Design an enzyme around this catalytic site. Sequence first.
Site, PDB file in Angstrom:
ATOM      1  N   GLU B  15     -74.862 -29.877 101.338  1.00  0.00           N
ATOM      2  CA  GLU B  15     -75.585 -28.859 100.788  1.00  0.00           C
ATOM      3  C   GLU B  15     -77.192 -28.732 101.039  1.00  0.00           C
ATOM      4  O   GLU B  15     -77.664 -27.770 101.591  1.00  0.00           O
ATOM      5  CB  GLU B  15     -74.667 -27.901 100.160  1.00  0.00           C
ATOM      6  N   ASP B 202     -66.129 -19.723 104.917  1.00  0.00           N
ATOM      7  CA  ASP B 202     -64.384 -19.091 104.536  1.00  0.00           C
ATOM      8  C   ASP B 202     -64.275 -17.813 104.077  1.00  0.00           C
ATOM      9  O   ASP B 202     -64.747 -17.975 102.534  1.00  0.00           O
ATOM     10  CB  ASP B 202     -63.754 -21.058 103.955  1.00  0.00           C
TER      11      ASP B 202
HETATM   12  N1  LIG Z   1     -61.885 -21.375 100.312  1.00  0.00           N
HETATM   13  C1  LIG Z   1     -63.141 -22.704  99.304  1.00  0.00           C
HETATM   14  N2  LIG Z   1     -62.768 -22.521  98.503  1.00  0.00           N
HETATM   15  C2  LIG Z   1     -63.158 -22.872  97.113  1.00  0.00           C
HETATM   16  N3  LIG Z   1     -64.227 -23.826  97.091  1.00  0.00           N
HETATM   17  C3  LIG Z   1     -64.761 -23.390  98.594  1.00  0.00           C
HETATM   18  N4  LIG Z   1     -66.486 -23.658  99.370  1.00  0.00           N
HETATM   19  C4  LIG Z   1     -66.385 -23.563 100.426  1.00  0.00           C
HETATM   20  N5  LIG Z   1     -64.903 -22.507 100.983  1.00  0.00           N
HETATM   21  C5  LIG Z   1     -64.107 -23.137 100.080  1.00  0.00           C
END
Ligand SMILES: Nc1ncnc2[nH]cnc12
Lengths: 244, 244
Positions: B15, B202
């Site tokens: 990241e 996401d």
């Molecule tokens: N859906 C998610 N839940 C928790 N941490 C995340 N990091 C990236 N996507 C995530």
Amino acid sequence: RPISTIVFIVAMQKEAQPLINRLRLVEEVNTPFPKEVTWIMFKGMYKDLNINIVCPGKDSTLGVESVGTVPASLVTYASILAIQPDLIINAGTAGGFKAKGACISDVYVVSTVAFHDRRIPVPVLDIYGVGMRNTFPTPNLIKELNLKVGRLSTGDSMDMSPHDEESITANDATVKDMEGAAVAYVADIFKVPTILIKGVTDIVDGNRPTSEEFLENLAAVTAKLDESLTKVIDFISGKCLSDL
Amino acid sequence: RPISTIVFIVAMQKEAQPLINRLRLVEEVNTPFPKEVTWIMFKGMYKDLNINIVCPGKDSTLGVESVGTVPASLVTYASILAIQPDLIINAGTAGGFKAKGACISDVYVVSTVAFHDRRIPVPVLDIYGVGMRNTFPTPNLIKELNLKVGRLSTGDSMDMSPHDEESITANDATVKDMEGAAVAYVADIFKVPTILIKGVTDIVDGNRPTSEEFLENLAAVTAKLDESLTKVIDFISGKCLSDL
Ligand SMILES: Nc1ncnc2[nH]cnc12
Ligand SMILES: Nc1ncnc2[nH]cnc12
């Protein structure tokens, strides 16, 4: 070389109190910790052992004991680096599963511990999540003192979602708590001998609830737990990390 | 007096990579950490700022990045005590809820963060569990750079049980991650200014796409995130903790 110093990590000072009284440990005023944390320490010399009981204390905002994996790890790190111990032991009350033969007030010696609430649906990361690990082997202890042995599952929730239940089941845990797995992780990086002792105060897969059965017994068991830790200290006194 | 040093806490080195490249930060060999941890540090001087990016690194057993609240807190403690910063910032990708208007690739500045996976069914302990807290107020930043603001919910699981869903809802979280709440806790004890920046990779309330949101977007957004952090560093450079 014989064991010289033992650092006890307890989430709640209430759980340790009895022991502190029987051993007449004194609360260190100048702790070797940062002026800003709320951590408390009790030092004492039982026979040929420097017993140190460190607790995360009470939250500076809520005023409640700072339980959970985060405070438990921070404390275990700081203690290790500070009063560098020969043997670190994590004691406290916990949840028992009668399905695995756990009666209330039972005193188990965790064999292997893992996390049941760190579900990462990824190839290798899911193993990391569970982050399962062994405790320092003490057969002469469990043998001599004739204690109960079982696996521990750790999670930041006192309740148990159906998700926690399935994982605790995949860990084959007999006892359930909120910090053990976290402690074992830190001590494992500094590769220092570690033991986890849990007193069952609530039967999780039982009828009576997880919050009221816990309270009417955090006295009866917290007592039995004390009596037990003493005899454990008593057993180690004089031995080497291998005589355990 | 002006901000001098900024410590960045990132769960995954992936990241942070882009930023490290653009700023040409050098990886400190002799870290001020214990010889045994696996933590990595990148130091550098951007304009009038000593930027330090500290990462928990990769697990010594599994070889996977040590994500989660436990490594995130340990690192945040050690860094604070070590390279005592003026401002600590926690950046990284996260889950978004379109119900709260979160599009993929969005870059929010967490306002308030809390835990959604530490359910303790007890009078005051349940508030401790949520352990909600504020981030350092930066109106000129969100104003000038015109960024998205929202609440963050933290939990040790990447998935989301129905139990996590209800709590994340009670936290009114727009973004979802695995460490933020933990970082804010430590920095809060040493009362040091803290900021949390999250890149949405996401959409939790969506369809959880293909090898995109889980694989591609982590590149597309991790990129947008970098571009954003730079402009954030750029904005702070020269200011006081109150000019932000
Ligand atoms: N859906 C998610 N839940 C928790 N941490 C995340 N990091 C990236 N996507 C995530
Ligand atoms: N059921 C339970 N789960 C987690 N920690 C506990 N401590 C006491 N009872 C417990």
